[PDB]
Design an enzyme around this catalytic site. Sequence first.
Site, mmCIF file in Angstrom:
data_model
loop_
_atom_site.group_PDB
_atom_site.id
_atom_site.type_symbol
_atom_site.label_atom_id
_atom_site.label_comp_id
_atom_site.label_asym_id
_atom_site.label_seq_id
_atom_site.Cartn_x
_atom_site.Cartn_y
_atom_site.Cartn_z
ATOM 1 N N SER A 71 -11.889 -20.148 -6.396
ATOM 2 C CA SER A 71 -10.565 -20.097 -5.787
ATOM 3 C C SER A 71 -10.637 -20.382 -4.313
ATOM 4 O O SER A 71 -9.706 -20.909 -3.779
ATOM 5 C CB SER A 71 -9.892 -18.746 -5.897
ATOM 6 O OG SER A 71 -10.055 -18.195 -7.177
ATOM 7 N N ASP A 128 -6.247 6.460 -5.719
ATOM 8 C CA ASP A 128 -6.145 4.986 -5.832
ATOM 9 C C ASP A 128 -5.635 4.665 -7.215
ATOM 10 O O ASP A 128 -5.635 5.512 -8.097
ATOM 11 C CB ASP A 128 -7.587 4.354 -6.099
ATOM 12 C CG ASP A 128 -8.132 3.738 -4.895
ATOM 13 O OD1 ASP A 128 -8.350 2.575 -4.765
ATOM 14 O OD2 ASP A 128 -8.335 4.639 -3.974
ATOM 15 N N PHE A 145 -8.469 -6.583 2.649
ATOM 16 C CA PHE A 145 -8.141 -5.199 2.839
ATOM 17 C C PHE A 145 -8.294 -4.405 1.500
ATOM 18 O O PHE A 145 -8.884 -3.368 1.417
ATOM 19 C CB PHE A 145 -6.687 -5.169 3.369
ATOM 20 C CG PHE A 145 -6.220 -3.805 3.781
ATOM 21 C CD1 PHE A 145 -5.688 -2.900 2.869
ATOM 22 C CD2 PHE A 145 -6.305 -3.407 5.113
ATOM 23 C CE1 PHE A 145 -5.254 -1.640 3.278
ATOM 24 C CE2 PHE A 145 -5.866 -2.151 5.533
ATOM 25 C CZ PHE A 145 -5.330 -1.261 4.608
ATOM 26 N N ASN A 168 -6.299 -20.056 -10.986
ATOM 27 C CA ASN A 168 -7.665 -19.467 -10.950
ATOM 28 C C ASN A 168 -7.738 -17.969 -10.439
ATOM 29 O O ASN A 168 -8.467 -17.128 -10.928
ATOM 30 C CB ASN A 168 -8.552 -20.389 -10.091
ATOM 31 C CG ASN A 168 -9.978 -20.043 -10.296
ATOM 32 O OD1 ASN A 168 -10.539 -19.303 -9.495
ATOM 33 N ND2 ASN A 168 -10.549 -20.555 -11.370
ATOM 34 N N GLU A 205 0.767 -1.211 0.000
ATOM 35 C CA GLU A 205 0.000 0.000 0.000
ATOM 36 C C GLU A 205 0.807 1.275 0.000
ATOM 37 O O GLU A 205 0.342 2.289 -0.497
ATOM 38 C CB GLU A 205 -0.926 0.010 1.235
ATOM 39 C CG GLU A 205 -1.965 -1.105 1.192
ATOM 40 C CD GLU A 205 -2.971 -0.957 0.079
ATOM 41 O OE1 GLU A 205 -3.756 -1.801 -0.161
ATOM 42 O OE2 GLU A 205 -2.937 0.155 -0.596
ATOM 43 N N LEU A 236 -9.104 3.961 2.020
ATOM 44 C CA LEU A 236 -10.028 4.583 1.073
ATOM 45 C C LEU A 236 -10.959 5.592 1.769
ATOM 46 O O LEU A 236 -11.600 5.320 2.827
ATOM 47 C CB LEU A 236 -10.896 3.518 0.441
ATOM 48 C CG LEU A 236 -11.973 4.185 -0.407
ATOM 49 C CD1 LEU A 236 -11.410 4.539 -1.765
ATOM 50 C CD2 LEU A 236 -13.148 3.248 -0.597
#
Length: 164
Positions: free
Chosen positions: A117, A20, A104, A132, A11, A32
């Site tokens: 998955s 973003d 997250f 996948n 991040e 965010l």
Amino acid sequence: MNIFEMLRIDEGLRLKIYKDTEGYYTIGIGHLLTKSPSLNAAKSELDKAIGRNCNGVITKDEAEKLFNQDVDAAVRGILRNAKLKPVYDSLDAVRRCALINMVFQMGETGVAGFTNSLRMLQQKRWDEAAVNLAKSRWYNQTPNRAKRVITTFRTDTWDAYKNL
């Protein structure tokens, strides 16, 4: 390495409102603020979040505070989710970190949609699941990060972050 170190590599840290990869208003360590196009709406959310008049700028301290809250909320949300919980419980420590990382970045909802998955991770079919997971918007939009996460699931080691 732990979840905080991992996420902080993925991040980064920014003390000023920023956009973003998605064009959304964010601050700190991937926090965010709003999906809305107004810098003003983002500023308002920020001050609400911190409890002060920030003017689009926070301290390292505030960034880490938001980060502790966001990690805490990701874990709890995993735990409350009928689809995520069983997978999380089935996984070992390192892999649990990889799932947390996904939650997250994309939210509970987003990850719970990766039905196939999840099923494969539950069954401990590491190679199949890595193939996948890569067949997604997620991987196509943030390939270096998706690759690190996928490697972690695949290998059960922190080598992808070794480099970083």
